[PDB]
Design a protein around this ligand. Structure first.
Ligand SMILES: NC(=O)c1ccc[n+]([C@@H]2O[C@H](COP(=O)([O-])OP(=O)(O)OC[C@H]3O[C@@H](n4cnc5c(N)ncnc54)[C@H](OP(=O)(O)O)[C@@H]3O)[C@@H](O)[C@H]2O)c1
Ligand SMILES: NC(=O)c1ccc[n+]([C@@H]2O[C@H](COP(=O)([O-])OP(=O)(O)OC[C@H]3O[C@@H](n4cnc5c(N)ncnc54)[C@H](OP(=O)(O)O)[C@@H]3O)[C@@H](O)[C@H]2O)c1
Ligand SMILES: CC(C)[C@H](C(=O)O)[C@@H](O)C(=O)O
Ligand SMILES: CC(C)[C@H](C(=O)O)[C@@H](O)C(=O)O
Ligand SMILES: [Mg+2]
Ligand SMILES: [Mg+2]
Lengths: 414, 414
């Protein structure tokens, strides 16, 4: 192993489903491909500053670099794109953060980001989207956007079950469907690629459960199940039916009017939480035309991937869109954006995304004060109109800052 | 049959792939469920007016009502949701228009809208989205949005191949995948619904071919292949690879830089058309942050469904979003919106969508003058700020008009 365990740090433990965070926790991190080389260093500095200022030296993170992707090949050798120790370490230290990752073409290499999520069973993809005062947005009222996406992270089409057109496997599968299952619906069975889409009751319910619990835990107004159930009855439709069923069976969901919407009483604030659903295509117009009407979103893997980007663009873009992959044993924080090789190495991209993901990590560890300083700094720097390229557009009088520069601006406004 | 063939009309014929439209063409039409009862009458009046004014009485449409959905059951009896004659008539008269349709819950009834498209093999779902001066939009520069969506209409997950969780079929399919195909990727094989996603070379290429030909025919700047190929390699990825391949093999697509983008020279205007591609999630941010950079869009069934609504909301909403289902033998025009039973029968919804779909129909028949009068009227009425509920929002000084009222406003501005 080429990983070096920090000497002055201590491992975080999980006792009774509750995190036990030391004052010197060891936090593993993956630099990331492309721009990850730009944003990650900015994140480490901003986090260290937030922690240093919040607890005046009482607390401190012991960063431990781990590898995945290109750098892993440089470190562990050719073909070692995702070392087993990397998965071992994330699960063992409970909390980790990663920069963007890119999977090479071919080589029989599976998508590295999806591999991490699925190998660690981090079934929740949590992506909160809200507006930051001063952020240049293409819409008229970005302030109306304040939602939290709970995207199922372990099934759907992301299962990776598919076969190439004209391949022996594809023909074998197509032969079984037409001959044994009597399927006559394939328009062109020749030179036809095939993909499988699974959706289970347990996969659906553990995701929705987390979404409702988060709504209750943070006193949100509603949980909206987004699906395309009118066309995919047994997968997307099942997801919606299972979600409503869980709200009734586990949260005392009560019929609103003649339904289908339910109301769940917040055990804490006594507030009634609305449980509704919207068809995916229609939802894409709704978030733009009636944003204020939506809060927490529970949806399947693919739909969540699309909604994440559509919402982010509403409040400034993917440069300010954080996220987290959460499971029962550990959590891996990461920004919604990619490696943008186009800008890679230029120290020009917006580090806000990975930084706000670190803010989620801090909150997750219970270091809410350090988390609050990051939000304060971010809001201060953006308001000071000292921002990165992606914000400069739709920004008159804004001063352009380099990636590392913006990080410093955040610390300056803490 | 309860259908009455117009006495003074004549059937449109297709000779050499070219439509032969008489001056008194018989045009079949489906009223539609819900609000279809409101918008359809407005459309017939507006179209009749546009035609009457453009050709001063020389030309006239002979409307012939045909049935599908609820009204079909009223006419032909219980269980007759989609009469065979309806499909026969659309194919025979070549050009038809329909209001929104809703499929009942259960009854073993398949989605009626998809049934029409697939039974008639109308593989192209053409949905143009552009801004109309004076239209209240949630974005800052709706005028930058001017795109044309070419959505594959015959395959993808819309094939309707799926099995219910815990069903014998589902278990049989899951057993085959795990046992015979050795699939170990299903996270939860129990209580698991299964759906099949097919994508063929012929289905992909006939759609992309139509998109490029439209770009050439209308001198558009580019064709963008939208896909989620990084995750669905053999379906969405195949679609993108097949699209690029066709541009090269059939349109002399030439490498731009080191690729992957291609350039196709417009045989007519000598202009070079750009053939590029964008990942679906990223594309949803791109249309909002860099609209001007996109023109004609070629995408798969599901992706097209989502993009249609996301784009429409950008220029006023689904109340002003037309569309057409085009095949090799016939075409069925229809708005992107649904039956909105919530507002149904209230004569309050925006008829602009089905009316602009009729404008597409007229253009399709070569009656471009009548089509131009509809655009003129629409632009005039909206500019006069005499609009329907959906526009009134984000409209100060706008006067609210009833559905039928707005139709009259259009005719008044022709
Ligand atoms: N979880 C992940 O690690 C992850 C996520 C997404 C994609 N990927 C991968 O990364 C590679 C490139 O993919 P892509 O180009 O489709 O996606 P991407 O890297 O997110 O790039 C898409 C566009 O979004 C914007 N963007 C991304 N990061 C930004 C930042 N830090 N600050 C400001 N704007 C930012 C830019 O838009 P403008 O150019 O309009 O400014 C950018 O060109 C692929 O190999 C892909 O699989 C990985
Ligand atoms: N091709 C079709 O015939 C078609 C298309 C889509 C859906 N459907 C079906 O119709 C039913 C209802 O579905 P849905 O509620 O998901 O979709 P929908 O009927 O399109 O309604 C969605 C929302 O979009 C807006 N809208 C729709 N038509 C409008 C119009 N003419 N003018 C102004 N705004 C309009 C309204 O938004 P606000 O309430 O925010 O104003 C409406 O409540 C279902 O049975 C569904 O399967 C059929
Ligand atoms: C890179 C890709 C596999 C990934 C996904 O589709 O989830 C990305 O788009 C993201 O949102 O993290
Ligand atoms: C009603 C539904 C089957 C249809 C589709 O998904 O294409 C609708 O959303 C539309 O866009 O016409
Ligand atoms: Mg994404
Ligand atoms: Mg739709």
């Amino acid at each position: 192993s080429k990983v070096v365990v920090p000497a002055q740090g201590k491992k975080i433990t999980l006792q009774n489903g509750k995190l036990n965070v030391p004052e010197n926790p060891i936090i593993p991190y993956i630099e990331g491909d492309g721009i990850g080389v730009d944003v990650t260093p900015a994140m480490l500095k901003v986090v260290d500053a937030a922690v240093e200022k919040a607890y005046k030296g009482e607390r401190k993170i012991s960063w431990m670099e781990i590898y995945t992707g290109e750098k892993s090949t440089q470190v562990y050798g050719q073909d070692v794109w995702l070392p087993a120790e990397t998965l071992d370490l994330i699960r063992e230290y409970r909390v980790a953060i990663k920069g963007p990752l890119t999977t090479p073409v071919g080589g029989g290499i599976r998508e590295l980001n999806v591999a991490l999520r699925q190998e660690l069973d981090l079934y929740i993809c949590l992506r909160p989207v809200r507006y930051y005062q001063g952020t240049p947005s293409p819409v008229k009222h970005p302030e109306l956007t304040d939602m939290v996406i709970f995207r199922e992270n372990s099934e759907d089409i992301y299962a990776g079950i598919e076969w190439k057109a004209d391949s022996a496997d594809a023909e074998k599968v197509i032969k079984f469907l037409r001959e044994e299952m009597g399927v006559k619906k394939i328009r062109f069975p020749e030179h036809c690629g095939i993909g499988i889409k699974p959706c289970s009751e347990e996969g659906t319910k553990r995701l929705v459960r987390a979404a409702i619990e988060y709504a209750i835990a943070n006193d949100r107004d509603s949980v909206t199940l987004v699906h395309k159930g009118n066309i995919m009855k047994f997968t997307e439709g099942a997801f919606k039916d299972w979600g409503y069923q869980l709200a009734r069976e586990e949260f005392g969901g009560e019929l609103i009017d003649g339904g289908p919407w339910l109301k769940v009483k917040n055990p804490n604030t006594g507030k009634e939480i609305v449980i509704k659903d919207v068809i995916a295509d229609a939802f894409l117009q709704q978030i733009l035309l009636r944003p204020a009407e939506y809060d927490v979103i529970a949806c399947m893997n693919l739909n969540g991937d699309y909604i994440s980007d559509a919402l982010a663009a509403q409040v400034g873009g993917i440069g300010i869109a954080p996220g987290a992959n959460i499971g029962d044993e550990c959590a891996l924080f990461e920004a919604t954006h990619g490696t943008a090789p186009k800008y890679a190495g230029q120290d020009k991209v917006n580090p806000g995304s990975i930084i706000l993901s670190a803010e989620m990590m801090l909150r997750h560890m219970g270091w809410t004060e350090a988390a609050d300083l990051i939000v304060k700094g971010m809001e201060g720097a953006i308001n000071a109109k000292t921002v990165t390229y992606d914000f400069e557009r739709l920004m008159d009088g804004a001063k352009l800052l380099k990636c590392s520069e913006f990080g410093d601006a955040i610390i300056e406004n803490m």
